[PDB]
């Protein structure tokens, strides 16, 4: 039922990527789209939804398109009042509507009854393993009861980028890495944290893994980040 854990051969190798790791770092280093109580105003293809969300930071966009795994998923949230959280991209971001644009995948949760009383944040445990040994442990926070794995992942990596140099401009001190989610019902799933081999990094193609819009229960989900160094 739950996705099988990865074996060394199933994981992307940092040493096999010859492009600029900064393009991966860019996607998680204090980078994300965030909006509350919004509703979609358009759609480009059947499986996507467009929202009017402005770049609160440095005004780089006022429209966000988010792609989902299929049309049922888009139909499900099309008329709902929702919250949005995800990692956006610009390279190869294309769509028209009827001002800057930005793109993303998944990141959608119904807003009604998904928050805590008096606006309280829920802590989510994250344990980091380097070469099979727990090295540091910490928590990330979310204001949602049901939160997308994407949101949690982003917060986890943002933290690890500043505290452990998960990704640097040229490369990474780590050879492999995957982030694993453990739900209170026993179901687990994971995402490879390293770019595919070659000299280029396709951001859009990488982020597409979030299009299933997978959500987890923040009060009970557990997160494990497994990293390995080329040596030790």
């Amino acid at each position: 039922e739950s996705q099988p854990d990865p074996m060394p051969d199933d994981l992307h190798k940092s040493s096999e990527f010859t492009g600029t790791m900064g393009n991966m770092k860019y996607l998680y280093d204090d980078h994300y789209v965030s909006a509350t109580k919004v509703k979609s105003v358009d759609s480009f293809f059947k499986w996507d939804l467009i929202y009017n969300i402005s770049d609160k930071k440095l005004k780089n966009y006022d429209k966000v398109k988010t792609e989902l795994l299929n049309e049922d998923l888009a139909k499900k949230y099309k008329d709902e009042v929702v919250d949005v959280y995800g990692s956006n991209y610009y390279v190869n971001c294309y769509f028209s509507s009827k001002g800057g644009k930005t793109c993303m995948y998944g990141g959608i949760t119904k807003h009604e009854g998904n928050h805590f009383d008096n606006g309280n944040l829920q802590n989510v445990l994250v344990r980091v393993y380097e070469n099979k040994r727990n090295t540091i442990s910490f928590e990330v926070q979310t204001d949602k009861k049901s939160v997308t794995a994407q949101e949690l992942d982003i917060k986890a990596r943002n933290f690890l980028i500043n505290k452990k140099n998960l990704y640097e401009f040229n490369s990474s001190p780590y050879e492999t890495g995957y982030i694993k989610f453990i739900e209170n019902n026993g179901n687990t799933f994971w995402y490879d944290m390293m770019p595919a081999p070659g000299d280029k990094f396709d951001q859009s193609k990488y982020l597409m893994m979030y299009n299933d819009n997978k959500t987890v229960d923040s009060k009970s989900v557990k997160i494990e980040v497994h990293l390995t160094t080329k040596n030790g």
Partner: peptide
């Protein structure tokens, strides 16, 4: 392939 997507966006705008 990503280049076809650029064209499709212009095509939709022109359709409208």
């Amino acid at each position: 392939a990503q280049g076809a997507l650029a064209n499709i966006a212009v095509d939709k705008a022109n359709l409208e």
